[PDB]
Coordinates of C-alpha atoms in Angstrom, one line a residue:
Chain A
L1 CA 132.4 166.0 338.6
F2 CA 131.4 164.5 335.3
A3 CA 131.2 160.9 336.7
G4 CA 127.4 160.8 336.9
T5 CA 126.4 163.1 333.9
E6 CA 124.3 160.4 332.3
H7 CA 121.4 162.9 332.0
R8 CA 123.5 165.3 329.9
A9 CA 125.4 162.8 327.7
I10 CA 124.5 164.7 324.5
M11 CA 126.3 167.8 326.0
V12 CA 129.2 165.7 327.2
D13 CA 129.6 164.2 323.7
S14 CA 129.4 167.6 322.1
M15 CA 132.0 168.8 324.6
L16 CA 134.4 165.9 323.7
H17 CA 134.0 166.5 320.1
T18 CA 134.7 170.2 320.3
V19 CA 137.8 169.6 322.4
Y20 CA 139.0 167.0 320.1
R21 CA 138.6 169.3 317.0
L22 CA 140.4 172.0 319.0
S23 CA 143.2 169.5 319.6
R24 CA 143.3 169.1 315.8
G25 CA 143.9 172.6 315.5
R26 CA 146.2 174.7 313.3
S27 CA 147.7 178.0 314.4
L28 CA 147.8 176.3 317.9
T29 CA 150.9 176.5 320.0
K30 CA 152.5 173.4 321.7
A31 CA 151.4 174.6 325.2
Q32 CA 147.8 175.1 324.1
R33 CA 147.7 171.8 322.5
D34 CA 149.1 170.0 325.6
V35 CA 146.4 171.8 327.7
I36 CA 143.8 170.6 325.4
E37 CA 145.0 167.1 325.4
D38 CA 145.3 167.0 329.2
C39 CA 141.8 168.2 329.5
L40 CA 140.6 165.5 327.2
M41 CA 142.5 162.8 328.9
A42 CA 141.1 163.8 332.3
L43 CA 137.5 164.1 331.0
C44 CA 137.7 160.7 329.5
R45 CA 138.9 159.1 332.7
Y46 CA 136.0 160.1 334.9
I47 CA 133.5 159.9 332.0
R48 CA 131.6 156.5 331.8
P49 CA 132.5 154.3 328.9
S50 CA 129.1 154.4 327.3
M51 CA 129.5 158.1 326.7
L52 CA 132.7 157.7 324.8
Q53 CA 131.1 155.7 322.1
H54 CA 130.9 158.5 319.6
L55 CA 134.4 159.7 320.3
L56 CA 135.7 156.2 319.6
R57 CA 133.7 156.2 316.5
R58 CA 135.5 159.3 315.3
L59 CA 138.8 157.9 316.5
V60 CA 138.3 154.9 314.4
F61 CA 138.4 157.2 311.3
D62 CA 141.1 159.5 312.5
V63 CA 143.8 157.3 314.2
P64 CA 144.3 154.7 311.6
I65 CA 145.9 157.3 309.3
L66 CA 148.9 157.3 311.7
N67 CA 149.4 161.0 311.0
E68 CA 151.2 163.4 313.5
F69 CA 148.0 164.1 315.4
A70 CA 147.9 160.4 316.3
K71 CA 150.0 160.5 319.4
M72 CA 147.5 161.8 322.0
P73 CA 144.5 159.7 320.8
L74 CA 146.7 156.5 321.1
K75 CA 147.5 157.2 324.8
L76 CA 143.8 158.2 325.3
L77 CA 142.6 154.9 323.9
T78 CA 145.3 152.9 325.8
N79 CA 144.2 154.3 329.1
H80 CA 140.6 154.1 328.4
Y81 CA 140.8 150.5 327.5
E82 CA 143.1 149.6 330.2
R83 CA 140.7 151.0 332.9
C84 CA 137.5 149.7 331.1
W85 CA 138.8 146.4 329.9
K86 CA 136.2 144.6 332.2
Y87 CA 133.3 146.6 330.4
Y88 CA 134.2 145.2 327.0
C89 CA 135.6 141.9 327.9
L90 CA 133.6 140.4 330.7
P91 CA 129.9 139.4 330.0
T92 CA 128.8 140.6 333.5
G93 CA 130.6 143.9 332.7
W94 CA 132.3 146.5 334.7
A95 CA 130.4 147.1 338.0
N96 CA 128.0 149.9 338.0
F97 CA 129.0 150.6 334.3
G98 CA 127.2 147.9 332.5
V99 CA 128.4 146.0 329.5
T100 CA 129.4 146.8 325.9
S101 CA 126.6 147.4 323.4
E102 CA 128.2 145.3 320.5
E103 CA 128.7 148.4 318.3
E104 CA 131.5 149.5 320.6
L105 CA 133.3 146.1 320.2
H106 CA 132.9 146.4 316.5
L107 CA 134.5 149.8 316.4
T108 CA 137.2 148.5 318.8
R109 CA 138.0 145.6 316.4
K110 CA 138.0 147.9 313.5
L111 CA 140.5 150.1 315.3
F112 CA 142.7 147.3 316.3
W113 CA 142.9 145.9 312.7
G114 CA 143.3 149.3 311.1
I115 CA 146.2 150.4 313.3
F116 CA 147.8 146.9 312.8
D117 CA 147.7 147.1 309.0
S118 CA 148.7 150.7 308.8
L119 CA 151.6 150.2 311.1
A120 CA 152.6 147.1 309.2
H121 CA 152.7 149.1 306.0
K122 CA 154.4 152.2 307.4
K123 CA 158.1 152.7 307.7
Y124 CA 159.8 152.6 311.0
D125 CA 159.3 155.5 313.3
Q126 CA 160.7 154.9 316.8
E127 CA 158.2 157.4 318.4
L128 CA 155.2 155.9 316.7
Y129 CA 156.2 152.4 317.7
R130 CA 156.7 153.8 321.2
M131 CA 153.3 155.1 321.2
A132 CA 152.0 151.7 320.1
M133 CA 154.3 150.2 322.7
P134 CA 151.4 150.8 325.1
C135 CA 150.3 149.2 322.0
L136 CA 147.0 147.6 320.7
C137 CA 147.5 145.4 323.8
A138 CA 144.9 147.2 325.8
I139 CA 142.4 146.9 322.9
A140 CA 143.1 143.2 322.5
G141 CA 142.7 142.6 326.2
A142 CA 139.4 144.4 326.1
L143 CA 138.1 142.5 323.2
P144 CA 136.9 138.9 324.0
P145 CA 138.8 136.3 322.1
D146 CA 135.4 134.8 321.2
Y147 CA 133.9 138.0 320.0
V148 CA 132.1 137.4 316.7
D149 CA 131.3 140.5 314.6
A150 CA 127.7 140.4 313.3
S151 CA 128.9 142.4 310.2
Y152 CA 131.8 140.6 308.4
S153 CA 132.8 142.1 305.0
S154 CA 135.3 143.9 303.0
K155 CA 135.4 147.7 303.2
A156 CA 137.0 147.6 299.8
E157 CA 138.1 151.2 300.6
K158 CA 141.2 153.2 300.3
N159 CA 138.1 164.1 303.0
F160 CA 136.0 160.9 302.5
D161 CA 134.6 160.9 299.1
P162 CA 132.2 158.2 297.8
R163 CA 132.6 158.1 294.0
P164 CA 129.4 157.0 292.1
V165 CA 129.0 155.4 288.8
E166 CA 126.6 156.9 286.2
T167 CA 125.0 154.8 283.5
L168 CA 123.8 157.8 281.4
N169 CA 126.6 156.9 278.9
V170 CA 124.6 153.8 277.8
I171 CA 120.8 153.5 277.3
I172 CA 118.7 152.5 280.3
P173 CA 116.2 149.7 279.9
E174 CA 112.6 150.7 279.3
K175 CA 111.5 147.5 281.2
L176 CA 113.6 148.9 284.1
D177 CA 111.9 152.4 283.7
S178 CA 108.5 150.8 283.8
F179 CA 109.6 148.9 286.9
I180 CA 110.8 152.1 288.5
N181 CA 107.5 153.8 287.6
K182 CA 105.4 151.0 289.1
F183 CA 107.7 151.1 292.3
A184 CA 107.0 154.8 292.7
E185 CA 103.4 154.2 292.2
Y186 CA 103.3 151.4 294.9
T187 CA 105.5 153.4 297.3
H188 CA 102.9 156.2 297.0
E189 CA 100.2 153.5 297.6
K190 CA 102.0 152.5 300.8
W191 CA 102.1 156.1 301.7
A192 CA 98.3 156.4 301.3
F193 CA 98.0 153.1 303.3
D194 CA 100.0 154.6 306.2
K195 CA 98.0 157.8 306.1
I196 CA 94.8 155.7 306.3
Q197 CA 96.3 153.7 309.2
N198 CA 97.5 156.8 311.0
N199 CA 93.9 157.7 311.5
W200 CA 94.4 161.3 310.3
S201 CA 92.3 162.4 307.3
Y202 CA 94.3 164.2 304.5
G203 CA 93.0 167.6 303.9
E204 CA 91.5 168.9 300.6
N205 CA 93.0 172.4 301.0
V206 CA 96.7 173.0 301.8
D207 CA 97.1 173.4 305.7
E208 CA 100.4 172.9 307.5
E209 CA 98.4 172.7 310.8
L210 CA 96.6 169.5 309.8
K211 CA 100.3 168.3 309.7
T212 CA 99.6 165.7 307.0
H213 CA 101.1 166.0 303.5
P214 CA 98.7 168.3 301.6
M215 CA 99.7 166.5 298.3
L216 CA 97.6 163.6 299.5
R217 CA 94.9 163.7 296.7
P218 CA 93.2 161.0 294.5
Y219 CA 95.7 159.5 292.0
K220 CA 93.7 160.8 289.1
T221 CA 94.8 164.4 290.2
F222 CA 98.3 163.5 291.4
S223 CA 100.8 165.8 289.8
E224 CA 103.3 164.1 287.3
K225 CA 106.0 166.7 288.3
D226 CA 106.5 165.2 291.7
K227 CA 107.0 161.7 290.1
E228 CA 109.5 163.0 287.7
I229 CA 111.6 164.9 290.2
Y230 CA 111.6 161.8 292.5
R231 CA 112.5 159.7 289.6
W232 CA 116.1 161.0 289.4
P233 CA 116.8 159.6 293.0
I234 CA 115.0 156.3 292.2
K235 CA 116.9 156.1 288.8
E236 CA 120.3 156.7 290.6
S237 CA 119.5 154.1 293.2
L238 CA 118.6 151.4 290.6
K239 CA 121.5 152.3 288.4
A240 CA 123.9 151.9 291.5
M241 CA 122.0 148.6 292.3
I242 CA 122.8 147.2 288.7
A243 CA 126.3 148.7 288.9
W244 CA 127.4 147.1 292.1
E245 CA 127.4 143.7 290.5
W246 CA 123.7 143.1 291.5
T247 CA 121.6 141.6 288.7
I248 CA 117.8 142.0 288.6
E249 CA 116.1 139.1 286.6
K250 CA 112.6 137.8 286.6
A251 CA 112.8 134.3 288.1
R252 CA 109.8 132.9 286.0
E253 CA 109.1 133.4 282.3
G254 CA 105.8 135.3 281.5
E255 CA 104.1 134.1 278.3
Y256 CA 94.1 148.0 298.3
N257 CA 94.8 145.8 301.3
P258 CA 98.1 144.0 300.6
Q259 CA 97.9 140.4 299.5
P260 CA 101.5 139.7 300.6
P261 CA 101.4 141.8 303.8
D262 CA 104.7 143.1 304.8
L263 CA 105.9 140.7 307.4
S264 CA 108.7 141.5 309.8
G265 CA 108.9 137.7 310.5
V266 CA 110.2 136.9 307.1
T267 CA 114.0 136.0 307.7
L268 CA 116.8 137.2 305.4
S269 CA 120.0 135.4 305.1
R270 CA 123.5 136.9 305.8
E271 CA 124.4 137.5 302.1
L272 CA 121.0 139.1 301.3
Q273 CA 121.3 141.3 304.4
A274 CA 124.8 142.3 303.4
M275 CA 123.3 143.5 300.0
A276 CA 120.5 145.3 301.6
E277 CA 122.7 147.2 304.2
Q278 CA 125.2 147.9 301.5
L279 CA 122.4 149.4 299.3
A280 CA 121.4 151.6 302.3
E281 CA 125.1 152.6 302.5
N282 CA 124.9 153.6 298.8
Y283 CA 121.8 155.6 299.6
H284 CA 123.8 157.4 302.3
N285 CA 126.7 157.7 299.8
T286 CA 124.2 159.8 297.6
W287 CA 123.0 161.5 300.6
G288 CA 126.4 162.6 301.7
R289 CA 127.2 163.6 298.2
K290 CA 124.3 166.0 297.8
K291 CA 125.0 167.0 301.5
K292 CA 128.5 168.0 300.5
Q293 CA 127.1 169.8 297.3
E294 CA 125.2 172.1 299.6
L295 CA 128.0 172.3 302.1
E296 CA 130.7 173.3 299.5
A297 CA 129.1 176.8 299.5
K298 CA 129.8 176.8 303.3
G299 CA 132.8 174.5 303.4
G300 CA 133.0 174.1 307.2
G301 CA 131.1 172.5 310.1
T302 CA 131.2 169.0 308.7
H303 CA 128.2 167.4 310.0
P304 CA 129.0 164.7 312.7
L305 CA 126.6 162.2 311.5
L306 CA 128.4 161.8 308.1
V307 CA 129.6 158.3 308.8
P308 CA 128.8 154.8 307.5
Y309 CA 125.6 153.2 308.7
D310 CA 127.6 150.1 309.8
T311 CA 129.9 152.3 312.0
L312 CA 127.0 154.3 313.4
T313 CA 124.3 152.9 315.6
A314 CA 121.7 150.5 314.1
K315 CA 118.9 152.7 315.3
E316 CA 119.7 155.5 313.0
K317 CA 120.4 152.6 310.4
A318 CA 117.1 150.9 311.4
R319 CA 115.1 153.3 309.2
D320 CA 117.0 152.7 306.0
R321 CA 117.4 149.0 307.0
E322 CA 113.7 148.5 307.2
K323 CA 113.2 150.3 303.9
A324 CA 115.8 148.0 302.3
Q325 CA 114.1 144.9 303.7
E326 CA 110.8 146.1 302.4
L327 CA 112.2 146.8 299.0
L328 CA 113.9 143.4 298.8
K329 CA 110.7 141.7 299.8
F330 CA 109.0 143.7 297.0
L331 CA 111.4 142.3 294.5
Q332 CA 111.3 138.6 295.5
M333 CA 107.4 138.7 295.9
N334 CA 107.0 140.1 292.4
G335 CA 109.7 137.6 291.3
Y336 CA 112.2 140.2 290.4
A337 CA 115.2 138.3 291.9
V338 CA 118.2 140.3 292.7
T339 CA 121.2 138.1 292.5
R340 CA 124.8 138.8 293.5
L341 CA 132.4 132.2 302.3
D342 CA 129.8 130.9 304.8
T343 CA 132.5 131.6 307.4
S344 CA 132.0 129.8 310.7
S345 CA 131.6 131.7 313.9
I346 CA 135.0 130.2 314.9
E347 CA 136.6 131.8 311.9
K348 CA 134.8 135.0 312.6
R349 CA 136.2 135.2 316.2
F350 CA 138.7 137.9 316.8
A351 CA 141.5 135.6 318.2
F352 CA 141.2 133.5 315.0
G353 CA 142.2 136.2 312.7
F354 CA 144.8 137.5 315.1
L355 CA 146.5 134.1 315.1
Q356 CA 146.1 133.8 311.3
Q357 CA 148.0 137.1 310.9
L358 CA 150.7 136.0 313.5
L359 CA 151.2 132.8 311.5
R360 CA 151.5 134.7 308.3
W361 CA 154.1 137.0 309.9
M362 CA 156.0 133.9 311.2
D363 CA 156.3 132.7 307.5
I364 CA 157.5 136.2 306.6
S365 CA 159.9 136.0 309.4
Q366 CA 161.4 132.7 308.3
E367 CA 161.7 134.3 304.9
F368 CA 163.6 137.3 305.9
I369 CA 165.9 135.5 308.4
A370 CA 166.8 132.9 305.6
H371 CA 167.6 135.8 303.2
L372 CA 169.5 137.3 306.1
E373 CA 171.8 134.3 306.6
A374 CA 172.2 134.0 302.9
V375 CA 173.5 137.6 302.5
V376 CA 175.6 137.4 305.6
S377 CA 177.5 134.2 304.3
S378 CA 178.5 136.1 301.2
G379 CA 178.1 139.5 299.6
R380 CA 176.9 141.3 302.7
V381 CA 174.3 144.0 301.9
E382 CA 173.9 146.4 304.9
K383 CA 170.6 147.6 303.5
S384 CA 168.5 144.9 305.0
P385 CA 165.4 145.6 302.9
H386 CA 163.1 143.8 305.3
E387 CA 164.2 146.3 308.1
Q388 CA 160.6 147.5 308.4
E389 CA 159.4 144.0 308.9
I390 CA 162.1 143.0 311.3
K391 CA 161.3 146.1 313.5
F392 CA 157.4 145.6 313.3
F393 CA 158.0 141.9 314.3
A394 CA 160.3 142.7 317.2
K395 CA 158.7 145.9 318.5
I396 CA 155.0 145.1 318.1
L397 CA 154.2 141.5 317.7
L398 CA 156.3 139.9 320.4
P399 CA 155.1 142.4 323.2
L400 CA 151.6 142.0 321.8
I401 CA 151.9 138.2 321.9
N402 CA 153.2 138.2 325.4
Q403 CA 150.5 140.5 326.9
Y404 CA 147.7 139.0 324.9
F405 CA 148.4 135.3 325.8
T406 CA 149.3 136.2 329.4
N407 CA 145.8 137.7 329.6
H408 CA 143.9 135.0 327.8
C409 CA 145.9 131.9 328.9
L410 CA 142.8 130.4 330.6
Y411 CA 140.6 130.8 327.6
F412 CA 142.9 128.8 325.4
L413 CA 143.4 126.2 328.0
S414 CA 139.6 126.0 328.9
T415 CA 137.5 123.1 327.7
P416 CA 133.8 122.6 327.5
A417 CA 134.0 120.0 330.1
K418 CA 136.4 122.1 332.4
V419 CA 136.1 125.9 332.0
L420 CA 139.0 127.4 333.9
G421 CA 138.4 131.0 332.6
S422 CA 135.3 133.1 333.7
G423 CA 133.8 132.8 330.2
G424 CA 134.4 131.0 327.0
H425 CA 136.7 128.1 325.8
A426 CA 139.0 128.3 322.8
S427 CA 138.3 126.2 319.7
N428 CA 140.4 123.3 318.6
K429 CA 141.4 125.3 315.6
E430 CA 142.6 128.2 317.7
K431 CA 144.6 125.6 319.9
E432 CA 146.2 124.3 316.8
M433 CA 147.1 127.7 315.6
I434 CA 148.8 128.7 318.9
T435 CA 150.7 125.4 319.0
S436 CA 151.8 126.0 315.4
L437 CA 152.9 129.5 316.3
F438 CA 154.9 128.2 319.3
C439 CA 156.6 125.7 317.1
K440 CA 157.4 128.0 314.3
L441 CA 158.9 130.6 316.7
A442 CA 161.1 127.9 318.3
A443 CA 162.4 126.8 314.9
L444 CA 162.8 130.6 314.0
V445 CA 165.0 131.1 317.0
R446 CA 166.8 127.8 316.8
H447 CA 170.6 128.4 316.2
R448 CA 169.7 132.0 315.3
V449 CA 169.4 133.6 318.8
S450 CA 172.4 135.9 318.1
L451 CA 170.9 137.5 315.0
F452 CA 168.0 138.7 317.0
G453 CA 170.2 140.7 319.3
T454 CA 168.4 142.3 322.2
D455 CA 165.1 140.8 321.0
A456 CA 166.0 137.2 321.8
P457 CA 164.8 137.6 325.4
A458 CA 161.5 138.8 324.1
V459 CA 161.3 135.6 321.9
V460 CA 162.0 133.4 324.9
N461 CA 159.5 135.0 327.1
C462 CA 156.8 134.8 324.3
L463 CA 157.7 131.2 324.0
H464 CA 157.3 130.7 327.7
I465 CA 153.8 132.2 327.5
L466 CA 152.8 130.2 324.5
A467 CA 153.9 127.0 326.2
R468 CA 151.9 127.8 329.2
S469 CA 148.9 128.5 327.0
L470 CA 149.0 125.3 324.8
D471 CA 146.6 122.5 325.2
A472 CA 148.7 119.7 324.0
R473 CA 146.2 117.1 325.2
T474 CA 143.6 118.3 322.7
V475 CA 146.1 119.1 320.0
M476 CA 147.7 115.7 320.1
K477 CA 144.4 113.7 320.4
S478 CA 142.2 115.6 317.9
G479 CA 144.5 117.6 315.8
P480 CA 146.0 117.8 312.3
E481 CA 149.0 115.6 311.5
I482 CA 150.9 118.8 310.5
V483 CA 150.6 120.4 313.8
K484 CA 151.4 117.2 315.6
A485 CA 154.4 116.6 313.5
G486 CA 155.5 120.1 314.2
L487 CA 155.4 119.5 318.0
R488 CA 157.2 116.2 317.5
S489 CA 159.9 117.8 315.5
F490 CA 160.3 120.4 318.2
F491 CA 160.8 117.8 320.8
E492 CA 163.2 115.7 318.6
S493 CA 165.3 118.8 317.7
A494 CA 165.5 119.6 321.4
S495 CA 166.9 116.2 322.0
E496 CA 169.4 116.5 319.3
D497 CA 170.6 119.9 320.6
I498 CA 170.9 118.4 324.1
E499 CA 172.9 115.5 322.8
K500 CA 175.4 117.8 320.9
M501 CA 175.8 120.0 323.9
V502 CA 176.6 117.0 326.2
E503 CA 179.0 115.7 323.5
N504 CA 180.8 119.2 323.4
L505 CA 181.1 118.9 327.3
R506 CA 182.5 115.4 326.8
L507 CA 185.0 117.4 324.8
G508 CA 184.9 115.0 322.0
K509 CA 185.3 118.3 320.1
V510 CA 187.7 121.0 321.3
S511 CA 185.2 123.8 322.1
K512 CA 181.0 128.9 315.6
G513 CA 178.5 125.9 315.5
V514 CA 179.3 124.7 318.9
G515 CA 179.0 128.1 320.4
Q516 CA 175.8 128.7 318.5
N517 CA 174.2 125.5 319.9
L518 CA 175.4 126.1 323.4
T519 CA 174.2 129.7 323.6
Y520 CA 170.8 128.8 321.9
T521 CA 170.3 125.8 324.3
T522 CA 171.2 127.6 327.7
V523 CA 169.4 130.9 326.8
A524 CA 166.1 129.6 325.2
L525 CA 165.7 125.8 325.1
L526 CA 166.3 124.7 328.6
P527 CA 164.0 127.5 330.0
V528 CA 161.3 126.9 327.4
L529 CA 161.5 123.1 327.7
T530 CA 161.3 123.4 331.5
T531 CA 158.2 125.6 331.3
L532 CA 156.6 123.2 328.9
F533 CA 157.3 120.2 331.1
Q534 CA 156.0 122.1 334.1
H535 CA 152.8 123.1 332.4
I536 CA 152.1 119.6 331.1
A537 CA 152.7 118.1 334.6
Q538 CA 150.5 120.8 336.3
Chain B
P1 CA 90.5 146.9 318.1
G2 CA 92.9 149.0 316.2
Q3 CA 95.1 147.8 313.3
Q4 CA 97.4 150.8 314.0
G5 CA 97.7 153.7 316.4
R6 CA 97.8 151.6 319.6
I7 CA 99.1 154.6 321.5
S8 CA 96.2 156.8 322.5
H9 CA 96.1 160.4 323.8
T10 CA 93.1 159.5 325.9
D11 CA 93.2 158.0 329.3
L12 CA 91.3 154.8 330.3
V13 CA 89.1 155.1 333.4
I14 CA 88.2 151.6 334.6
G15 CA 85.6 151.6 337.4
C16 CA 84.8 148.8 339.8
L17 CA 81.5 148.5 341.7
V18 CA 80.6 146.1 344.5
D19 CA 77.4 145.4 346.3
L20 CA 78.2 144.3 349.8
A21 CA 74.7 142.7 350.4
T22 CA 74.3 140.7 347.1
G23 CA 78.1 139.8 346.7
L24 CA 77.9 141.2 343.2
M25 CA 81.0 142.8 341.5
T26 CA 80.7 144.8 338.2
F27 CA 83.0 146.8 336.1
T28 CA 82.8 149.8 333.7
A29 CA 85.2 150.9 330.9
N30 CA 84.5 154.6 330.5
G31 CA 81.0 154.8 331.8
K32 CA 80.0 151.8 329.6
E33 CA 79.0 148.6 331.6
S34 CA 81.4 145.8 331.0
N35 CA 80.2 142.3 330.5
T36 CA 82.4 140.8 333.2
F37 CA 80.7 140.2 336.5
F38 CA 81.6 138.2 339.6
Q39 CA 79.6 136.8 342.5
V40 CA 81.3 136.1 345.9
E41 CA 80.2 134.6 349.2
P42 CA 79.3 136.6 352.3
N43 CA 82.0 137.7 354.7
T44 CA 84.6 137.9 351.9
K45 CA 87.3 140.4 352.2
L46 CA 88.4 142.1 349.0
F47 CA 91.3 144.5 348.4
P48 CA 91.4 147.0 345.6

């Protein structure tokens, strides 16, 4: 019955939040917890994706911890993204449900990366790996491979506690104090301007009904006390500005209607925006700090909105964003320059970072396998310190690779001239990365199939999928000699292995090394090579 | 003309007058005669 409750989305969101907090409930029995979960699952199914935005926002801060309460949310998100993958992925969207806002995609990418990093760091837990065996695969399929996050930065980060930095230990510049006083004067002048513009005449007496600020009075009468009380916030803000490696300096050396009217048109670069929004985030840091100062007496009912501006919607951000833009304008237009990469859209794309991490883990895989043969040859250590890395590889990366590239094969094979997929074509760099990944995995499994045990089938299947996904034409015409040499080496090594097999079957050797080569070939090489040839011919 | 406060609590009542014997068409803003005027030929059919 909740399918069409778009007109009560506020209440639906409150409902979902309450049930989630009840699920995260102490003194709550197993059956009660299971009932709560089941209710949340069922509600989420029939609820439209647009409604679940806030719940996903909260999960983005909860799930990454990978605590004990992380089981149900993982399955919830898995099912949600499985069913609503069209919504996030396709540009047309899911029929009758619209398209993703962009903030939803940003949160989705944050969740993917947070879970990935956390699980990589964590020690093996069969159940946690089984819960992420439904895996980040749904999230990845939902995310467009070409998705570029408008906000790209480092969180620099670690209930949540923003720790400030207080300068009172050292003296504070008198020039900066004068600047702050002039800033307060001018902000009050903009306040008077906005009152004049509003068309409502400030009152001489104090009258709440007239609904303007009674303090509005000629400057010659304005009370100092208000300025001094407001000064501590302004001081804190400018101290934080100077502290976060931002330096204010006058660009040039000095021996009512605005002249530089505040223009929305004036463009701001990516790095200056980053500074402005991070300054707004510091304002919200102080705001949440004093919020917690008043709350500590209560100690409960944590305010839902206490989240980063970048995570929450831009509209709630828009206020502080416009304030920071106006402030920065002020500084530049009085010459008080505030000082203190250029990553391409292709670098920013989600698939790019995914492949980068996969290649890094491939290097790590080469590393631990080499160490493994070294220890097996002599001085066997049963510890296998890389156990966690091995299990992460085999249990997460390979199924993830399989599912992701099976889903997005057409995107990687598409070209601007010929677009097989519904939307988007992979970049040449992405094509090179996928080809290099294929070659590295083939080298990894070469003559080492046995050590993988039951995971070798997974390796072979992932190799099949990667082979089908490769664009060897582009890679070999316009591609780095490194990748091209890797592919040539793969082919040459395949030829050598086949020659050795045929020799053994000539019985030039009796028929260890021969068994290793034979099993590797018959199990992996012939299928993978056949698939590659088929894909090339097709 | 308003630099700000474009939204108005008041409602705008535009009036349209036509003389069917002189072919003259005039407009009013809120009881104030607008400068715009049109003249049309006889037998003209006009829909509001």
